[PDB]
Design a protein around this ligand. Structure first.
Ligand code: CL
Ligand code: CL
Ligand code: CL
Ligand code: NA
Length: 129
């Protein structure tokens, strides 16, 4: 599914991301926009042979099992395909683990480079939340 902006904000809010580890909801929506273009189905191979999955481009090196990243972990205890679902529950839950892991939302390169230090509240402007 390709979310609309506010639709994603609503979904991430209901699943508990707003202010999660101190990151306002606009940070999460912004991250999703530049990670996946709000597309739950997005996949992108990494140079090390891992792949990033779903609305928040969660990486099989650490966080999910895709069957083809040798020597990786699965800290979210999920198949990576769980992260491509139109229902974002798995993605959000996994994102909570990631952001709790010491590095905050720096774990998402698109967040660091396109959202961090910007007016991320813009990403939830207009939304009924
Ligand atoms: Cl915000
Ligand atoms: Cl959802
Ligand atoms: Cl932090
Ligand atoms: Na893995």
């Amino acid at each position: 599914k390709v979310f609309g902006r506010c639709e994603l904000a609503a979904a991430m809010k209901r699943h508990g991301l707003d202010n999660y580890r101190g990151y306002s909801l606009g940070n999460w929506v912004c991250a999703a926009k530049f990670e996946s273009n709000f597309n739950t189905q997005a996949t992108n191979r990494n140079t090390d042979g891992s792949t990033d999955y779903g609305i928040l481009q969660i990486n099989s090196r650490w966080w999910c099992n895709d069957g083809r990243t040798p020597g990786s972990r699965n800290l979210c205890n999920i198949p990576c395909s769980a992260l491509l679902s139109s229902d974002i529950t798995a993605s959000v839950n996994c994102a909570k683990k990631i952001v709790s892991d010491g590095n905050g939302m720096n774990a998402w390169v698109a967040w660091r480079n396109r959202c961090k230090g910007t007016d991320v509240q813009a990403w939830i402007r207009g939304c009924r939340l």
